[PDB]
Design a protein around this ligand. Structure first.
Ligand SMILES: O=P(O)(O)O[C@H]1O[C@H](CO)[C@@H](O)[C@H](O)[C@@H]1O
Ligand SMILES: [Mg+2]
Length: 448
């Protein structure tokens, strides 16, 4: 076999059998051999095991003569920002993002925070780690503590014109992850009145693991918004590289619509720019980007494809329907902080509620949401669907699974690259009835 913890985009496994201090130190040694010259930035999330995992990573790296910059407890996006800002050779974030409590992992990048994935070094690291029986060497390089967030915070604030901000009332829900530390540091520089829910970092997660997609966790943010008459609410996953929005009615906003919203926000600052988006749900993004004078660029879903395409295109912003938002100026990396600052600035400047900013777009391009199927035979199942729709002659695109455009409706059907799973997305041209009948039709075919 091979080490299960090494996935397509990152390392994720149960502690201690899938991931432990010895593997972490071995990963540091193997990572040293993969990077260009320079030091390595290390950071970690709130999980109880994360500091020790970072400490082993450090020991392996310095045993290989790599200077380590320890930026401490942080969000995943701070490892991206600091790796790029400090012109490091690389960086690793120790995080479980949103996995259960007996789980942990790492997210690895090289220069300029470029991702290290299965096929761009991560499996090379895996195989080196898998075959490494050598004795732990002793450190021949140093560790520097660098917890100053000033540059990071100034960079967050630079996305908005602070004198145009209104004193909005915002619910913030860290889910006992790490987002609250950054909110509290931004707060003295912002006019908003914050309503803090599940604010303190707690690696035991007394209120549940930080996953705003769970309806139980969703409802705590919705309730705080409604009970306090907040303008909107924001929730983050544990390492807060994803954020999730709730309008003034408590309604969770499906992430598809935030791509076109955030693209328009950005395009008013950087006119004529290119905007990268995924193929799962498209029509609304294409229209909003073009309406805002931008150029939409279709790209295979997955954060490493998005970033690579943004780089080759000098795209100012890339957005994925699944709550990933990437920013050229942020080392082409994703942030869970920039999107809500942009949204709060848009609400402040426009005088429109978050609800009204998206409502007409949701009516014009209703979507199913991402619907997952675990089926006995994915390939046979997909063939059943294509067979059933063949007579209608859809316009097909194979950028990322199968996209079929029927005119008034379209779908994308993909195999997940991170899970053995089929993923379905359907949208229509302003037709909620057509949306439901087609979604159900495709579901039955897949389940057949
Ligand atoms: O559908 P997939 O292949 O399993 O990818 C999903 O996870 C990726 C990494 O978080 C994301 O980059 C993708 O956009 C998506 O959320
Ligand atoms: Mg995350």
């Amino acid at each position: 076999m091979t080490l299960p913890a090494f996935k397509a985009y990152d390392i994720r496994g149960r502690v201690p059998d899938e991931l432990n201090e010895d593997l972490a130190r071995r990963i540091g040694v193997a990572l040293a051999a993969q990077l260009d010259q320079g030091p390595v930035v290390l950071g970690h999330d709130v999980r109880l095991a994360s500091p020790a995992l970072q400490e082993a990573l450090s020991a392996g790296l310095r045993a290989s003569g790599r200077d380590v910059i320890d930026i401490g407890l942080c969000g995943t996006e701070e490892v991206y920002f600091q790796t790029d800002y400090l012109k490091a050779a690389g960086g690793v974030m120790v995080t479980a993002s949103h996995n259960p409590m007996d789980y942990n992992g790492m997210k690895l990048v090289r220069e300029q925070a470029r991702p290290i994935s299965s096929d761009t070094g991560l499996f090379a690291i895996r195989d080196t780690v898998a075959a490494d029986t050598a004795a732990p060497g002793e450190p021949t390089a140093s560790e520097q503590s660098r917890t100053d967030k000033t540059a990071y915070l100034e960079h967050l604030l630079s996305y908005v014109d602070r004198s145009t901000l209104k004193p909005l009332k915002l619910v913030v829900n860290a889910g006992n992850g790490g987002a609250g530390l950054i909110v509290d540091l931004l707060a003295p520089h912002l006019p908003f009145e914050f309503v803090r829910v599940f604010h303190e970092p707690d690696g035991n997660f007394p209120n549940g693991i930080p996953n705003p997609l769970l309806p139980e966790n969703r409802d705590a943010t919705a309730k705080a918004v409604k009970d306090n008459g907040a303008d909107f609410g924001i929730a983050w996953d544990g390492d807060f590289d994803r954020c999730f929005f709730f309008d003034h009615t408590g309604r969770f906003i499906e992430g598809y619509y935030l791509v076109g919203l955030l693209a328009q926000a950005i395009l008013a600052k950087q006119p004529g720019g290119k905007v990268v988006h995924d193929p799962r749900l498209t029509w609304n993004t294409v229209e909003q980007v073009e309406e805002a004078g931008g150029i939409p660029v279709l790209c295979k879903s997955g954060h490493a494809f998005i970033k690579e395409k943004m780089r080759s295109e000098n795209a100012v912003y890339g957005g994925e329907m699944s709550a990933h938002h990437y920013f050229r100026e942020f080392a082409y990396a994703d942030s869970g902080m920039i999107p809500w600052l942009l949204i709060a600035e848009l609400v402040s400047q426009s005088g429109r509620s978050l609800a009204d900013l998206v409502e007409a777009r949701m009516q014009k391009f209703p979507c199913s949401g991402e619907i997952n199927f675990k089926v006995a035979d994915a390939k046979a199942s997909v063939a059943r669907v294509m067979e059933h729709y063949a007579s209608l002659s859809p316009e097909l695109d194979y950028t990322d699974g199968i996209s079929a455009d029927f005119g008034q409706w379209r779908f994308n059907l993909r195999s997940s690259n991170t899970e053995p799973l089929l993923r379905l997305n359907v949208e229509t041209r302003g037709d909620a009835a057509l949306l439901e009948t087609r979604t159900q039709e495709i579901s039955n075919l897949l389940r057949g």
